Amino acid sequence: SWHDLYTVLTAVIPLYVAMILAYGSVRWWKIFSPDQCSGINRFVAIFAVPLLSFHFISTNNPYAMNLRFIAADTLQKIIMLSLLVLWANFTRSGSLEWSITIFSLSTLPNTLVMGIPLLIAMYGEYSGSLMVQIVVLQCIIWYTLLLFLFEFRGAKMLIMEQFPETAASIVSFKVESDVVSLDGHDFLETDAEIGDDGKLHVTVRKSKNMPPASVMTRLILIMVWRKLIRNPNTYSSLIGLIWALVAFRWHVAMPKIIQQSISILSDAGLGMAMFSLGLFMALQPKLIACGNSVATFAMAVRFLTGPAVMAVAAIAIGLRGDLLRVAIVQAALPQGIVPFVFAKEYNVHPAILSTGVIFGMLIALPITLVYYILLGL
Template sequence: MITLADFYHVMTAMVPLYVAMILAYGSVKWWKIFTPDQCSGINRFVALFAVPLLSFHFISSNDPYKMNLRFIAADTLQKIIVLVVLAIWSKLSKRGCLEWTITLFSVSTLPNTLVMGIPLLKGMYGEFSGSLMVQIVVLQCIIWYTLMLFMFEYRGARLLISEQFPDTAGSIVSIHVDSDIIEDFSFGNRRGLESNNNEGEKVGDEKPKAMPPTSVMTRLILIMVWRKLIRNPNTYSSLIGLVWSLVSFRWNVQMPAIVAKSISILSDAGLGMAMFSLGLFMALQPRIIACGNSIAAFSMAVRFLTGPAVMAAASIAVGLRGVLLHVAIVQAALPQGIVPFVFAKEYNVHPDILSTGVIFGMLIALPITLVYYILLGL
């Protein structure tokens, strides 16, 4: 059972993050310290430096040879189920699109395991649950955040084609991508993309209803996504962190102190900077609930009801029982993760929804997880 000391530990983990967020909010809204361009620069620093080093820290310090495979399988199956359902929905529904697929996947399956999960679950179920939360964080960094980046870049490639060839996209039969095209994905860069068409260039009012053939799209997207991912620090931090953990825990190799301290300087500030970026984003919005009340309520329902329900089904399917099943469900009911917001802001895909999920999710997370904890214990 959670004691007052456990509750204090949870507050100790949460309150400093809210301090960082409030300071950032005030620095824009009240004190006018940062401009919108400077806020974007801070978020980019978080996405390209603080978050990758934070991911490296947790991946490299986790023992990959002692992971609970059944628990990991349940978490993986939950995310696969959600992805499959969202993919079917995006194909069959008129409202379905890649942007909402990315957002709903983030909201339903990527909780705030690091900040809330570790102290809260330790208080509920003991020290062993903290190790399980670290394992979830490691998989998020290695697999699911990388998958999100891939989907973001896939979306960027599609938008680039539709904007570069608005009148002739459907007739393109081949595309050559120059290396310069990946320098800028805000679609202001028009250089380095050439196409061959079945027909001559057509100028008119009617827009094509089809994208280029699948083979052309696939080749372009894979080229552009690959070039972006290999230049993204998050990719290298996950890969290097995994390799280091495999080596260090296999042969008991210690990281040189000078390297470890260099990494810790930024990794320790990763979550704080992410919350600071969140506060900056809030201050630039006309209202705190940036996405609106109805969408906020919908996202909260997806986060705290759909996510745990799918996790419960996935956990039972892989054979989790007893305390492990309870831990899996409660961690799925944690609030929205901070890192997905950083990515959403960087790629401008529903950052208002993700910011609302982080802010209000963390406010109501404790009573909600306590309800799950009590119900599962009956």
């Protein structure tokens, strides 16, 4: 039909209007300076996104989750991880960075900003609830797993570089409180001291053999804790989950004054998110970053492999009806912002992820509309 297409367009165009307004304000009309845009982006990331996430999570009911949908979403990621492990361990071309980038491209779409309105327009409010559950799972688990992988890579790099031969007998790690990351952007020095028994201890502070897995486990856990304790998204997710649990357990209603206090800043989340995405689009030197072959490979992976593995897993478990379609449409969404930020901070193929987010936001309307039409027959 065409009325449903008009409803989908009505839902999706205002986001693009905000994006184009920001793009023109920076590129055509020359209104905002780069550092002013940085300040707007900082405000958005610190305030508008965490409050929107809190508002979405604290309304979701954790006692009415759809088990099979979560099972399919987890099964596709298990399939992807298995494929990556087999490719990396049993082929000379495999690498950890490529595995991380492929996992991010093929398994982490943008569900918060764009997924909820588009899926609500396409199928209804139950699709919105499913997107909320997916966002909750993504925030609690998959972002934590990405951080685990990034911290493991950083720790491996530090161990390999600092102790090419001495790292054989290391058993303990010490890190000062001033250390916040293992990216390498700062001056990290590890003093070494001989133990009484004969082993060697190392202390990490700010200015090819493997030790046993226990010490890496401890170090990675410490780093992951130190970075989760200083991230607004973790606080938003945890507080929202706890409040949702208690409120749907004891039917407790939040005070109206606190609700309005949260909403007065939560109401700016979607428009400011799209505006900041437009600012990011305008600040880039050119729309396509990596190049023709790399960009077409990334776009093909994002818009084909994700839907393909989603279909395989969904018919494998037994998803049927509109739910199945929802999964496929969820798989074809543009790639998320949080993995892009992670790739920027750890500098693991940031150009490919930037091409992903921006060009996917640009060309998701034709691709998602085509998916909707084909699944509509």
